[PDB]
Amino acid sequence: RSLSERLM
Amino acid sequence: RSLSERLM
Amino acid sequence: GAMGSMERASLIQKAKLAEQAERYEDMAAFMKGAVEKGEELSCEERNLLSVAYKNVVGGQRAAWRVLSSIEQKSNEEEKGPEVREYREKVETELQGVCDTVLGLLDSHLIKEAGDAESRVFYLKMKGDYYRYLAEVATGDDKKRIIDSARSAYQEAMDISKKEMPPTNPIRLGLALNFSVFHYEIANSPEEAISLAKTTFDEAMADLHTLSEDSYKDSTLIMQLLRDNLTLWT
Amino acid sequence: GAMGSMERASLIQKAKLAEQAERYEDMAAFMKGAVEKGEELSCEERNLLSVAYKNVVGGQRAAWRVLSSIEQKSNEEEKGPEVREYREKVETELQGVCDTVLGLLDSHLIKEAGDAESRVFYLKMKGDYYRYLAEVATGDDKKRIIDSARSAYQEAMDISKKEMPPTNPIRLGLALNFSVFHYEIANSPEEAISLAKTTFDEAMADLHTLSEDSYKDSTLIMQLLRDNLTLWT
Ligand SMILES: N=C(N)c1cc(-c2ccccc2)c(-c2cncn2CCN)s1
Ligand SMILES: N=C(N)c1cc(-c2ccccc2)c(-c2cncn2CCN)s1
Ligand SMILES: [Ca+2]
Ligand SMILES: [Ca+2]
Ligand SMILES: [Ca+2]
Ligand SMILES: [Ca+2]
Ligand SMILES: [Cl-]
Ligand SMILES: [Cl-]
Numbered sequence A, B: 001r002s003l004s005e006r007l008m
Numbered sequence C, D: 001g002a003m004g005s006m007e008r009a010s011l012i013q014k015a016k017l018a019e020q021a022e023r024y025e026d027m028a029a030f031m032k033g034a035v036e037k038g039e040e041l042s043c044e045e046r047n048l049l050s051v052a053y054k055n056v057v058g059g060q061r062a063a064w065r066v067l068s069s070i071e072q073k074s075n076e077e078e079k080g081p082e083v084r085e086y087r088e089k090v091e092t093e094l095q096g097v098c099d100t101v102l103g104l105l106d107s108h109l110i111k112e113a114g115d116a117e118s119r120v121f122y123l124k125m126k127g128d129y130y131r132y133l134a135e136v137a138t139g140d141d142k143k144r145i146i147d148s149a150r151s152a153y154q155e156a157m158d159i160s161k162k163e164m165p166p167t168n169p170i171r172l173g174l175a176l177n178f179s180v181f182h183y184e185i186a187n188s189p190e191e192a193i194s195l196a197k198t199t200f201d202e203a204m205a206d207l208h209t210l211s212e213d214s215y216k217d218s219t220l221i222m223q224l225l226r227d228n229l230t231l232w233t
């Protein structure tokens, strides 16, 4: 699965 | 901390 | 709400404690209570809200995928209605969390958000939670849910390109997630690849303007764009 | 209970699905419903019950420890009542889970358990959940909670030594957890060390009787005894 935005 | 029984 | 008697500052403090304790359901309840006080959220507070709900829905999505896979295998020995029932239970709870987040955005976070950093953040969030709804949608609603995600992402993109530099971490995270929408949801892998490539290249060309710390922030997100391009090509 | 309308077999099936999906709160609710049907539990079913509640309470214990540490540091700038309040909230939810498990054991799992493998398992569980209560106890009840844990562990030990070989995995896990009780709860590190050593040595001498698979099962638990002895000496 594609990687989405991570928490900062 | 001491190690206790693990799930099997 | 059950948080109506707690001070706004105490809710924010407890959300930070819940984060440290990895109690994300509590964290989300505290931040929902803070939103419902009716005041706008600072950048830090918006990020607390996003962290809390992303962790809650992320666990639900992971569980839904496990159960959906078991259900699909069973439909290729008949084991009764239990797998479908339990997948539906998890699905309904996931939809309820998405609906809660979307309701906070609609009442009234988006309409009061005028600065690019807040408005883009919230519109991206709206796209993300419609995207999570689309992942489990099948009935006469998948098309309308997909179009709602697309519309929110597109409005956020239009603002971000006008008002933020190409290295801004919010702009980069938006482009990343819209590219995932194109690839995973909208059946548009070419659009996904094109968006990720242009986003990466325009950010690369703007890195020279940044401090050491901002450079680290922007390049960390650029690496996710690159990793997806490697997976997709 | 909310599980009263679901078949026993369906509750067990859904508990296994919840385990696979890492949905341990759901798993515990399904197994509580299964216990409340009133029938005894098989070995597999007892292990499903233990896995579910151990994961739920384990998350609570980890969160309580994070919050307790923050609270202690704050009591060495005054930040108001929020840290204490939130630690208390998590503590109360942990106590409620322990009370639920103890209530299932008392109504009526222990009294119907006649075979060593079931009775020892349940009495060990009773010791464990009183031990988790003791970890957070401070008032005029810590002493009585500690004695309740001790009494349950001791009865389980007496049965295990009479009725099970020294390599039996239930007997080994009981001895391990009673040794942790002695070291962490009862301020008896010498008793803990003595128990772990004797347990390890008597199991070592019985390994020759075991199949390849049983040998693997018993040696895995023996390694935990050894790791604690390394930490304690
Ligand atoms: N509590 C959390 N998870 C977060 C808090 C903050 C934050 C934001 C502004 C001010 C103070 C803290 C986050 C943030 C999101 N963009 C950058 N930052 C900074 C940290 N790199 S993330
Ligand atoms: N679903 C789980 N977590 C477990 C299920 C069982 C189990 C027990 C009996 C029969 C079938 C399965 C467990 C078990 C506990 N002692 C040994 N076993 C076997 C596995 N090594 S553990
Ligand atoms: Ca405003
Ligand atoms: Ca700007
Ligand atoms: Ca019996
Ligand atoms: Ca025997
Ligand atoms: Cl269900
Ligand atoms: Cl609280």
Ligand SMILES: [Mg+2]
Pocket: C007, C008
């Ligand atoms: Mg106030």
Ligand SMILES: [Mg+2]
Pocket: D007, D008
């Ligand atoms: Mg029946």
